Amino acid sequence: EELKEGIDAVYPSLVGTADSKAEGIKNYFKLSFTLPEEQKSRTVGSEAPLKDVAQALSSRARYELFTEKETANPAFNGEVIKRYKELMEHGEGIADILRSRLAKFLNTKDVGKRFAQGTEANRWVGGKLLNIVEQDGDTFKYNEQLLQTAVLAGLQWRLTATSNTAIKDAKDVAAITGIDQALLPEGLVEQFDTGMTLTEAVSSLAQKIESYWGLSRNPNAPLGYTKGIPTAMAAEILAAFVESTDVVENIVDMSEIDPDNKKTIGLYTITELDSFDPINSFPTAIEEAVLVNPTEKMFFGDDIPPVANTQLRNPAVRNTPEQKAALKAEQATEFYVHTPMVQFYETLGKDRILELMGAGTLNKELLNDNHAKSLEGKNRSVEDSYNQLFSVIEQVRAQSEDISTVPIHYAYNMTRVGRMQMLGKYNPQSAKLVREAILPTKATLDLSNQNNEDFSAFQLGLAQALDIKVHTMTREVMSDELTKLLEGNLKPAIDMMVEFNTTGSLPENAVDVLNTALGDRKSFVALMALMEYSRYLVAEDKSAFVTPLYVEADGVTNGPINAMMLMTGGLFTPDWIRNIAKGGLFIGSPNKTMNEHRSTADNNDLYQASTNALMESLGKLRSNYASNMPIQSQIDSLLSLMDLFLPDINLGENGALELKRGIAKNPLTITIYGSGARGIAGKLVSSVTDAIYERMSDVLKARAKDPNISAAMAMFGKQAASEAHAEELLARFLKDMETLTSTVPVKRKGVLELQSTGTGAKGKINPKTYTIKGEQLKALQENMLHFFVEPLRNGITQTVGESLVYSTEQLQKATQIQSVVLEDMFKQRVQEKLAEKAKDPTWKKGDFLTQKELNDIQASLNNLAPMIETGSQTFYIAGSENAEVANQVLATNLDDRMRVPMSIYAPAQAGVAGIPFMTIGTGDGMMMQTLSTMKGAPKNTLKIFDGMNIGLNDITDASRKANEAVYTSWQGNPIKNVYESYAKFMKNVDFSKLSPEALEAIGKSALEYDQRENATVDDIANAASLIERNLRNIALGVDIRHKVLDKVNLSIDQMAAVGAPYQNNGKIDLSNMTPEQQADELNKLFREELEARKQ
DNA sequence: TTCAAAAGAAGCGGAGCTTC
Ligand SMILES: Nc1ncnc2c1ncn2[C@@H]1O[C@H](COP(=O)(O)OP(=O)(O)OP(=O)(O)O)[C@@H](O)[C@H]1O
Ligand SMILES: Nc1nc2c(ncn2[C@@H]2O[C@H](COP(=O)(O)O)[C@@H](O)[C@H]2O)c(=O)[nH]1
Ligand SMILES: [Mn+2]
C-alpha cells in the first residue's frame, strides 16, 4: 500500500494532506483515487495534456508515435487534422473560462481566503473542485494536468454525446416533468427527447472525465468524493460550454403547461456541427489518443469489439457464458455498405429525403400548431439518421478504394430484459434509413430463370419490402401479387430507377414519382426493393446477381404467443389450441406453414381475434344499457368519432361495426405486460387527436387554395363523396366532440353513470390554434376508457386465456413483493451505516458511504435471492439507479447551480416490470440468444429482437433454425425460475423488520382491498406465503404441458414468411383431430404424467 | 403502475429548507 506515495508523486502540489484522520485541510482527490497498475490514459503524468494531445493530433506521424501504433485511421487526413487543430484551440478557450470561474468562486464570499485559513470548503457540495487546486501565492489555481485532461473529455463529449443519448418516450417525459402521461401536451415529449436533462448531461460528462483521468477509485473512499469530484468537474465544464454556446441551456417552466406543477427543468442541447464538417468523418481522434482502450470508435475489418462482461446498466449482473457467446457471434458479423442505396440517398439529397420520408418543408401557417410540432419531430428523426449515415460513410470511404468492400462490426450488449441491443442511436438495428445502406446480408443469385428458387427468394424479399404480407399467403400466390404490383402501380417508379441505375440521374419530380407509385407502401425498405429490382433489370449477368436484399423472418404476435406458451399453467383447452395456432404452433399437421394456416384454415391472427371479441363485449355492454338512450348515444358518438379519423375502425350505413387488428395490437401486448386500462385509453385518444390536428391542417390548406370552400368541404372534402354528404360528417364531428367532452361515464357500484363535466367543447374552430386541452382530453379519455378500452380488455382476456392472466398476476405480485423488501432493507441498512458514520470524527455528512460499504450492503441481500436464473440468462428485476437512497446533492457548479443529485445503484420497486422482463427475456430474448449460439447458427443476419433479416441465399435454413430456436425457448419455464427465487426469499425474509410504508406496499399485492387497512405483519406474511404456493403449482403445470406437448407431432412457424417450419418429430400423432379431440388427448397425457410424479 | 436507463431550480450557507 505505497499507493498513497504513488499518487502523491504524480500530484505533489494539490492542497491538503492525503490522510482522512489529518487535522487541517485534507485532500480527497488523493484519498479517493489511486494509480492503476496498468495504464488507462496517456495524459497521466503529462504536465500539459491539451498541449501534448494537440501535438499528437498535429500530424499522422505524431499521432502514430503518441498512440504507439504503426498506422492511424486513414480518415485522419489533412482536412480532419486542420479541424482538430481548431478544436484544440477551442479547448484552450474552455480551459480559460474554467480558470476564470474558479477565480470568481474563490473571491466571492471570501471562500479562497477562508479555505486558506482552514475552513474545509473542499468538502462542500460546491467546493469539491478545491481538491484539485494548488496554492498560488495568496490564492489558488487548478492543477493543470487534471484540468486540461478534463477539458479533453469535454471536447470528446461535445463531439459525440448526442449520438449516444437514450431515446425518451411518453413515460420518460411524464416522469421527468411530473405531468400525467395521458395529458402530455403536443411536442412536449419531442422537446424533451431533443435535449438532455441535467443528470443526463452531467453523468455522461462525468463518466468521460473520470475515464480520461485514468485513475482507479479507492474502495475505501466515500462516494461523495469518488463520484463527487468528477461530477463537480463535469458540472463546471457544462457551465463553461453554456458560456461558450457549445451547449444551450433551456429552463422549462412546467407551470405554463400545468398551473399546479411547480417544477422548472433544465434542458441542455449541444450545438450541432455542420453536416459537412470534416470532423464528422472521424469524431473520435481525441478518445483514441487519450485512452489505451477506447470505447468510442468504429470497428473496421478485423478490428472486433470486445465482449461486455456485465448486463447493460446492471453492473451487479454478469452476462452468462451463453449470453457472452451470443454477443461474440453478433459482433463477429460483417456489415457492408450497399453503394447503390448510398448513391440514391445522396442523389435525392437530404431535402428530398425529408420531403419523401419526413414532412418536407413546413409552412407554419398551413399547419395546425400541434400538428406542426409532430411534423418537426418527424423531420428531426429522418434528418439525424441521414446525417449520421453520411458521417459513417465518410469514415468508411477513407478505409479503402471500394467502399462496399470495407467490413464493419458493431458492438452489442445484453439489456435488462435479455435482448441483444446494438450500441448506438443510429445503427442498422435501430435506424431504418441506415438499415438499407449498411447490411450483413448478401447473396449471389441466379435470376436468369424466373422459375428458379433463387428468383422465388428474390420475389419474396421484394414483396415483403413492398408491404405485401408475405406470411399470410403461399409463395406462389405471393409471386402473382408482386408481379401485378411491379407491372402496375410501381412501374413508373421502376422505370425511373432503371434510368438512375443507367445514368446516375434522377428527374426533378423524383419525389412525386416515388410517392405516387408507393402510396401507403412507402418506407425505406420499399426504396431498397425498387432499387434492387431495377438493378436486376439492367444487370448484365443475371445469372450472378449480387444483392443485400433480405427477407425478415418475423414473429407472429410474438410477445403474446410467447406468454401463452410459457406461462399458461392449466389443462389444455380447445380455445387455447385454436388461438395458439394463430401464432404458428400447429398440432397434428406435419409440415404446416403459417402461409398455409392463414390462407386455408384461419385468416384471423391473435389481434384480429381479440378485436372480434371486443365487438362481442361491446354488444354485451349495449344490451345491459339497452333502454338507456343517453348511454347508447354516448357509445354511438365515440364510435362515430373514431370512425371519422381512425383507419382501423369503420361503421356502415346501418351502424354495422367493422374493426381491424391494428387497433388491438398495442393494447393486447401492453395489457399482458401489466398496463392499466387508463393508459391504453390515453394512447387511443392521442391517436384520435393527432388525426384531427392533421385534418385541421387540411382545412388551412384547402381553404388557402380556395377561400370560397365551405368548412364542411374544407375538413371532410377529401373524405366525402358529395357536398351534402360532407355536412353530415361535419355535423357528426361537432355532435361527437360536444357530447364526448361535456359528458363522461363513471362507474358507480358496478353500474355505468353519465355525469356532466361542465367543461364541454364550445366555440368556433380555429384550425391553426385548435387544441384539445386538459379537461376535454380527460373527458375523451373517460369515454374511451369505459366504452371501448374496458370491452377490449375483456376481449383480450378471452383471447389469451384467463389462465395466462392468472399466471402473470402471480408473477407480478411475487416479484413486486420481493422488490419492495430488497429496496426497503437496502435503505434501512444504508441509514444504519450512516448513523454509525456520525460517530466517526473524520466523516462529514455529505460524504455518504464507501463502495466497499455499499458492496457489503448489497451482498447482505443475497439470501433474499434478488437474481432470477434460468440456466442461460440472469434477470435482476429490482435493479435500478435512484436518487432516493442517498437523498442528497452530489455536486453543484461553482455558481451554486446545476445541482446533481447523488444517484446510487440499488434495488427499487419492480411495479409490473416482472411480466415483461420474464416474457421478453425468456421469449424473444432466449430465441435470439439460441439462434446465435445453436449448432449451425445462421450467419450474416441482422437480428432485431423478434425478427431476423436473412440474405436471400439462406432464407430456408435460417428460417427453420429460427423456428427451432422458438421451440427451444418454449422449453423455458419463467414462472419456475421466479418460484425458485421467491421460495428462497420466503425462507429468509423478516416482514417485521420492514418499514410501515414497505408493509403497505406488500399488502397491496398480497391482500385484497378489504383486509389491508389493519393487517398484521403476520397477515401479510401468510399472504406472501400463499403466493409461493400459487407459483409452485403454476410452474409444475407449465412443466407438465411442455413435456406433453413435446410428445406430440408439432409444426412450428412462429418466425414466419418463408414457409420453413420446424418439426419436433413427436411420435404421438394428433392429425385428423379437432381441437376438442386434441385437448382431450393432451389432457390424458397431462394426467398420466401427473401420476408419473405423484409416484 | 406496460418494459427495454435516471431525471426540478436556486437563495442562503456551507445542509437542507424553502419558494417558485
Ligand atoms: N409498446 C410495447 N411495449 C412492450 N413491449 C413491446 C411493445 N412493442 C413491441 N413489444 C415487444 O416486441 C415484440 C415484437 O413487436 P412487433 O412490432 O414485432 O409486434 P408483434 O407483437 O410481434 O405483432 P406482429 O409482429 O404480428 O405485428 C412484441 O410481441 C412485444 O413482446
Ligand atoms: N420492449 C419493447 N420493444 C419494442 C418497443 N417498440 C419496438 N420494439 C421492438 O423493436 C421492433 C421494431 O423494429 P422496427 O420497427 O425498427 O422494424 C419491434 O418489433 C419490437 O421487437 C417497445 O416499446 N418496447
Ligand atoms: Mn413480430
Ligand SMILES: [Mn+2]
Ligand atoms: Mn418485429
